[PDB]
Symmetry: C7
Subunit: 267 residues, 7 copies
């Protein structure tokens, strides 16, 4: 009735909620537009594609209006915990979606906090190998020796071995020279030691191994482990190998073809 | 009794909730229909299949009616946190279901924020390789060299290496020429250097390697690493290889068949 | 005492809760039965197995009675957040169980929103390959070339490459013809070019490669890359290959058996 | 003091909570026992092992007493949200534990909602292949051709390809007949076409391919693709192959051994 | 002031909380000790290592004191939701840690609810194969044929195929007899059929295949598929194979060595 | 105004909160220091590295001050649920980080609750194999036969097969003796049975198999399965094998080299 | 109206919230700046890159302003649980992103709590092997024998085997000497035992095996297992192997080439 308003004053609390609910909305909407403008303005400023910038700004818009709408529903007195539990799980959905996306971000942060490599540092990121051109924040671009550009996601980097090459200035070449069984072991060892000692780029302060490593099927395999600076490594390999090939057939030592004893049976 | 209503006025709060609960429903239903219309209208406008558009609009319908029903139950005074905890986990279920679906969306956003490739850019997305036709938002369509169309999900792209080819204009061809052990190393090197120097598409400012790389089982393998523009790469390979094949059997150098020494035992 | 009821009137609030709790139950039970009927009725209407329809309708029954029971316990004043936190995690359990089940549903939605393939479109879904018969909502049935029916879950599809064949009408055949080293390169190239030019189904506006691709161990391998319509591809392969086999041993060119030089040592 | 009880009546609320807390316990305990009886009774009724039935009934017992204890603590006024957040995560622990267990349940539900196979339907569930004996709810038992019983969890089924065989009644046999290079191609094709046409179980309305598929290293390989009913497939393979073996060495065509040209060098 | 206590009586509520907080602690501590005793007593009673029993009882101690401390802090009025959210995630940490531990428990429950194998039942649990000695609750111990004891975690069992052998009493032996191309097919088939028919342990009611399965490179391979009881399987294989080896070189049929045609070129 | 304090007394509640907030802080800080001392003192007492002990004690410090600060903010009346939801997820972050760390702890608890192996028990933990030296709580140290020390994390143990060797005292040696096709089967079987019967360490109560297992390509392979105590296994293998090698070339039986029939064609 | 303020005094509570909300902001902002300064100052002090230090300090800034803004919204009376549930899931997103980043931190803590290796301790971390240079907190740098620097993330270490070499001072060399079948077994064993006994670096207190291990295809393989100190291991291998190669062709024992019996058929 008309007198019902006079006795009690808690009906005030029913009324202020109403305009308060409007005050959740008419502030929430113009903000949702406003932010959706600014987020767009700071998207195009970074030169990011317009069909995507519009969509992400619209996502922000459609999220802030959702916040203010659910807040107004809770303001008047609707128990909005249901929708809340749903879009919380939607945030969880996009979070587990962006798991593999943000893992690359965290790994890119780690790769500059501490630096397993820099721009211009030859590496092998678990397979592919090349000179890093630039460690970006979501990916690591590197030029392999074949001239290809490989864009590795940083999460695949930090989740695996980072086999650097250009950190230590000195590395090792390993030759496996297969000679014949009938060759004199001491002759091979001395005519190889002369090679690796007359080569000036091989470091003598390190270990210079020339020792019999394997009794192969057809051949007998000598290992030659010689250290050289990381820039002179491949040239040392090629030069020492050409010198082996020349000094052996000068000395009469024969690199054997795949041998095969043949027992003969005429039938 | 009849006098029980007179002393206390909090019974009002029991009453307004009732119509308020109706005001959760008769507004919630017509909205649930209304949105379920509009969501359908903006589904068919995008030419999306009707049996699926109807189902998704019905999902929105059956979700908004759930919100308003749980809200009315909370309005009258039912403690609806149980159902809330259930459909929150249902939202979580569809979220972890849409994890692999929305990861492709996030990756498609990243692939246009920063561009590891564009339409018409030959790439190799961890295995398969081809010219990208169009980077869509959920997938990346590319035409391989065999004429097949490969539709790669962007999450499989960003989660792996993006081996581009058409970014850097210059690449490297690597020949591995196997000649016989009895061939003169210097003759091979000079008759190969003449080939790679008389070829005008090979870039001379880069490194032109012709050096002995391996002592094979039957053969001795020379590596030839020569740089050329990324368009002239395969033609340079084919031409230099034909020229090798012709200049070697002109010069007498023999590409060896798989050799096999045979020790004979008549028994 | 008996006078204790007269001074205070909040004891009313203790009383209405009681029948209110009954009003949580006697409405919750008949609904739980009622829905459990209708859910069953709309399960058998879809011809779904009765021992499973009964179980799922009983699950709905045993869930709605759980909601109303916990709600009545919260109504009287029990703090039911414990059981709530438990069956919320049970909903989470079935959600993470239905993760791999609903991922197929989401992927089936995506496969008709945008269509990497239609019914009758030959494809290769990361391994297995065949003509799609029907893209259902949880799975994709396709008939391989061997006549087998392969029912691929859509989550395994969207999570991998979709190598289509019947989208682009033109594809490429790649022959690798191994001839002997002593054969004339120009003779082989011209007697192959005549073959691929006199074949009318090979498209001449495309690239018609006949160029020396590899110096094999025993053979020398010419690549022949010729484009043809996707229907005439296999027949072109077979015809061009028969023609190669006939024109070569007409022209004297020999396809070599695996050669092996044998150095002889009588011991 | 003694007068402190007279002025205020909210002390009543402190008192009723006490017996109310007892009313959380003396109802919670006898229920926890009671359910723990019934859950056991409906466990042994299904013939489930007693040392496990006792443990699961004790789990239910120790969970319901936990609910009522935490509820009594919240009743008196303890803020029990800590323990709540802990056993909620314990429910989450058992949920993520039962993830791989309930995924099989959901997949078993899907495998009878829609049926990629029935009892007695030869299939190949991503590797292993056999006749399904019975699709249970957690697993799928099938007898392979070697007589082994393979119990596949349904989550491993739905998560992979379901290569059926006994759905389509017609399938394809593919022979790869390697003959010698010196054999007449037309003779081979006609003496094979006569075989596959005089075989009555080969379906002639389908495609009957006999065409030259490969120029092998030693051999030349003809493909023979012939369709037959899925029951007569293996017998057709064996019969056509025996007939090939007999008609070829009747016709003089020779299946070649691995050929190897040998260039001889006496040294 | 001193009069401030007289007007208001809610200060009582500040006071009872204090001793109530003590009543959270002096009950919580002696329980935490008490349970930590009993949990230890029921750990040593099961003969579980003392350095671990002490640690787990101390974990229970340090957890119950945490509950009562946080509860007292919430009792006085501290908002303890922060620490709550932290040790809830700690419970989640140990839960995701015990994921792989409790999955074995759930699988061990399943392996006795329904039994894919019993003690003494030869099986192959995805690789390793042997006679199950005892299915414990966390693991499955089985003795392989080589006498090794293999303790398989039940989660690795239920997550993979369970290839039983000792369920069905009858199994199949598959011989692949490679004979020469020049051998009479009918002679081989009849002298094999006589073998598999004169063997009394081979079941004749089943299928007794002796049919030409493959045209090998050097040999021609006959398949012999014969069924026998699962105990007599290996002995049947060995006996039938010895009989094949004897009856063939009695009948003149020759098992061929790897043949190789050699085209000779003196150069 | 000045009279505003007189009418209402709830302003008291605004005031006590203030010093109460201080009572959240001046107790929270000195505790945070105090615990951060004791946690450090019980870290150095266990000889744990100081740069890490300081960091973990500082983590405890910076966490307890966070608790008391958020609690004071909630005390005065700030709604601190935002920060709470953030550091709850931070606790979740460290929990999912410590997932693989605490899984090893749980597995180490299981490996001493029930013992698949003890110190000095030769095992093979899914690959690597050796004698366990000590099962620690986070790892399992074992010395392989090559003298290497392998520190296996217990989660990698419990998550895989535990192939024990030193539990059962008796194991099986399996020889696969390849003899020539022209050798007498009965002679081989009897001259092998004499070997395995005259060897006293072979257990005769077990099964002593000497039966023809395979018709190899070049050889015919007899299996010899003989049981011996787990300590005498390798010595039995070596002795029986030396005896086979000696008694066969005493008896004239020849172990065949890889045979190869050569069909000759002079061209 | 103007009299509305006089009757009720709860309007005070509406007013103090307002400036209180300002007191959430004007304290929250200057702190957010202040911390964002100090966090930057303690970032540059550690020499961390400025473009990243600025971003992380801005993240802290934009997070603390978010806390105070949401707190002010909750202060005035907005129900801010929606945004809370969103940025809680954002914290969860960065947490699951930093999962693989912080797992390395936890593993680096474990690798110094207990030490499977120290700086200068040769190891093999599941594949790659080298001398550890320094165990950092996020990674483990080690120099392999080839001179490469390998930076292993500690999570890849603790998650796999840690095959140490330099813990135990004594290790085992295993030679597999393949001699001919016609060689005297006792001669080989004694001329090998003399070698391994006249070598002073081989430990005689350990086991010195020289026993016939395998009947190879072409060869007969003797195993020689001899223990030596971990520093003298490779030199012992090389010396004993050279001595074998010399003493055998001194004694007439022949290391056999791959033998092959050839049955001859002139056709
Ligand atoms: C999946 C299914 C999960 C189920 C798990 C089973 C766990 C079993 C454990 C405990 C349940 C025992 C029930 C004990 C009943 C006494 C409850 C009591 O202690 O009451 C105290 C109240 C105090 O009132 P307050 O001032 O603090 O206001 C409260 C404020 N509020 C209005 C928050 C909204 O006193 C009152 O209100 C008036 C009290 C009137 C009590 C009447 C007796 C109960 C009658 C009907 C309810 C039937 C419940 C269904 C039981 C099913 C068991 C399976
Ligand atoms: C898996 C299971 C996990 C369990 C973990 C075990 C952890 C054990 C830790 C602590 C237990 C200590 C119990 C101390 C009892 C005194 C409690 C107290 O401090 O109460 C103070 C109350 C204040 O009330 P308020 O005005 O602030 O309104 C409160 C508003 N509310 C109505 C929110 C709905 O004063 C009152 O009301 C009257 C106080 C009446 C106290 C009577 C003595 C207790 C009698 C029966 C309850 C027995 C509980 C079962 C114990 C199980 C131990 C294992
Ligand atoms: C890891 C760490 C994370 C930390 C994140 C830092 C974010 C910083 C953001 C905001 C901090 C701003 C502090 C502003 C202080 C004014 C607070 C205020 O506006 O309060 C208004 C109240 C209204 O009262 P009410 O009727 O609504 O009852 C409330 C009911 N309740 C009893 C729920 C249980 O008025 C009152 O009660 C009396 C108000 C008296 C205010 C005295 C000034 C503050 C003094 C001491 C508190 C120190 C806090 C520590 C700050 C550390 C910053 C890092």
């Amino acid at each position: 009735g008309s007198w019902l308003v006079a006795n009690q004053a808690l009906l005030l609390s029913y009324a202020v909620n109403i305009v308060a609910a409007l005050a959740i909305i008419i502030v929430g909407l113009i903000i949702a537009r406003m932010i959706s403008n600014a987020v767009n303005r700071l998207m195009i400023s970074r030169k990011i594609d317009a069909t995507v910038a519009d969509f992400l700004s619209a996502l922000v818009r459609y999220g802030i209006i959702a916040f203010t709408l659910i807040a107004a529903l809770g303001r008047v007195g609707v128990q909005t915990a249901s929708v809340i539990a749903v879009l919380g799980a939607a945030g969880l959905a996009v979070g587990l979606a962006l798991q593999g996306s943000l893992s690359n971000l965290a790994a890119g942060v780690l790769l500059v906090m501490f630096r397993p490599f820099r721009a211009g540092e030859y590496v092998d990121l678990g397979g592919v190998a090349g000179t890093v051109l630039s460690v970006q924040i979501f990916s690591t671009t590197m030029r392999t020796a074949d001239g290809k550009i490989i864009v590795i996601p940083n999460g695949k980097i930090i989740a695996g071995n980072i086999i650097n090459f250009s950190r230590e200035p000195v590395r090792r070449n390993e030759f496996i020279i297969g000679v014949a069984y009938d060759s004199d072991i001491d002759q091979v060892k001395q005519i190889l030691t002369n090679i690796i000692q007359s080569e000036d780029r091989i470091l003598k302060d390190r270990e210079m191994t020339v020792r019999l490593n394997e009794l192969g099927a057809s051949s007998i395999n000598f290992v030659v482990r010689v250290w050289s600076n990381s820039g002179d490594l491949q040239n040392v390999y090629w030069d020492v190998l050409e010198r082996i090939k020349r000094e052996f057939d000068a000395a009469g030592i024969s690199f054997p073809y795949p041998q095969m004893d043949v027992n003969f049976k005429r039938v």
